[PDB]
Amino acid sequence: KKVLLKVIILGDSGVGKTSLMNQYVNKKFSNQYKATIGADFLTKEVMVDDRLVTMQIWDTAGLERFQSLGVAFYRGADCCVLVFDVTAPNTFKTLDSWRDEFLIQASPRDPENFPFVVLGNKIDLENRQVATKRAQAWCYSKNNIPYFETSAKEAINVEQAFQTIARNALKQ
Amino acid sequence: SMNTEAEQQLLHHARNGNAEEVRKLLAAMARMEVVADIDCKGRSKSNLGWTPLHLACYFGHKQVVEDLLKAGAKVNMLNDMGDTPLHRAAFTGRKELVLLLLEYDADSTVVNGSGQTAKEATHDKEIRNMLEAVERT
Ligand SMILES: Nc1nc2c(ncn2[C@@H]2O[C@H](COP(=O)(O)OP(=O)(O)OP(=O)(O)O)[C@@H](O)[C@H]2O)c(=O)[nH]1
Numbered sequence: 562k563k564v565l566l567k568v569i570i571l572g573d574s575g576v577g578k579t580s581l582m583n584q585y586v587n588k589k590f591s592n593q594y595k596a597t598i599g600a601d602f603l604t605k606e607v608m609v610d611d612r613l614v615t616m617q618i619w620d621t622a623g624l625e626r627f628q629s630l631g632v633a634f635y636r637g638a639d640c641c642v643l644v645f646d647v648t649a650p651n652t653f654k655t656l657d658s659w660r661d662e663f664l665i666q667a668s669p670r671d672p673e674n675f676p677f678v679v680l681g682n683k684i685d686l687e688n689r690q691v692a693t694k695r696a697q698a699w700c701y702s703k704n705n706i707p708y709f710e711t712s713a714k715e716a717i718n719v720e721q722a723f724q725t726i727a728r729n730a731l732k733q
Numbered sequence: 734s735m736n737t738e739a740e741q742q743l744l745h746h747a748r749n750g751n752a753e754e755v756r757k758l759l760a761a762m763a764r765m766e767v768v769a770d771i772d773c774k775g776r777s778k779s780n781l782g783w784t785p786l787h788l789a790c791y792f793g794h795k796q797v798v799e800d801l802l803k804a805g806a807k808v809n810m811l812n813d814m815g816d817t818p819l820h821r822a823a824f825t826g827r828k829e830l831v832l833l834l835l836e837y838d839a840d841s842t843v844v845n846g847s848g849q850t851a852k853e854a855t856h857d858k859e860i861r862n863m864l865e866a867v868e869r870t
């Protein structure tokens with residue numbers, strides 16, 4: 562068989578969504594910021610629990626008015642990755658609106674069990690402002706969402722987080 | 734030469750302040766689903782030599798100006814009169830637009846085909862002050 566999993570990456574402008582995707586797919590990182598204006602995807606062949614799957618990873622605009630255009634691409638997603646910046650508490654605050662907007666627009670049949678994963682990114686930086694335990698509490702309050710702390714720049718937890726993403730997305 | 738269909742649509746939507754349609758075009762452009770230069774210049778009598786940014790600044794379509802600037806529009810493009818978008822926001826007395834353009838490092842020293850700078854084109858005394866301040870930098 563061939564299984565294609567659709568994964569959607571959401572989060573505020575600048576949290577590192579594009580960087581996380583680029584680190585996972587191409588093992589490349591750039592400190593140069595170019596803002597994502599249009600949603601678009603990369604494809605990667607992933608191996609999950611001795612099963613080969615094609616992961617279609619969608620990168621979206623975090624910017625405040627372009628993000629409504631991302632909504633058209635929610636439909637059919639098998640997993641939703643929510644990303645925030647551990648140094649920027651305003652990007653943590655928006656996770657609920659991102660999640661609710663995804664749930665009502667994508668409209669899975671089983672919203673309580675739909676696969677989310679939450680990445681708290683940029684831990685390589687100094688002076689984090691969002692406490693690990695605070696993010697963990699939010700994730701737990703949403704029916705035990707898996708939480709990873711990542712660094713796209715230093716390649717910490719990117720592979721592990723996307724392995725969980727692949728696995729939960731693959732669940733029938 | 735010619736403009737693509739997406740470019741004509743971008744000039745039309747920018748001119749008329751259809752911000753959602755501008756953003757749909759900019760998103761399609763960013764992922765290369767359509768061919769269009771954000772800095773294109775109009776080729777019909779309705780927009781000849783103007784960029785989307787010129788049109789949106791002159792007609793005061795604020796959200797459009799923002800969206801174009803966030804998507805990377807060049808702030809110092811010239812139209813056939815030698816005007817920059819700053820020239821046309823200053824001329825029409827749009828304080829928030831002049832301020833937005835300065836925030837994107839608009840060159841306040843450009844002299845248009847009439848021998849005027851943006852400071853010389855305006856009538857609003859606040860804009861005249863802002864431009865005077867940025868000139869001496
Ligand atoms: N130090 C550090 N910088 C990072 C990390 N991840 C991303 N960045 C930087 O943060 C900036 C924003 O990163 P992006 O990947 O473009 O963020 P984005 O989420 O795609 O932002 P939008 O496209 O506007 O929605 C870039 O300069 C990156 O190089 C990280 O893990 N550590």
Ligand SMILES: [Mg+2]
Pocket residue numbers: 578579580595596597620621623
């Ligand atoms: Mg991006």
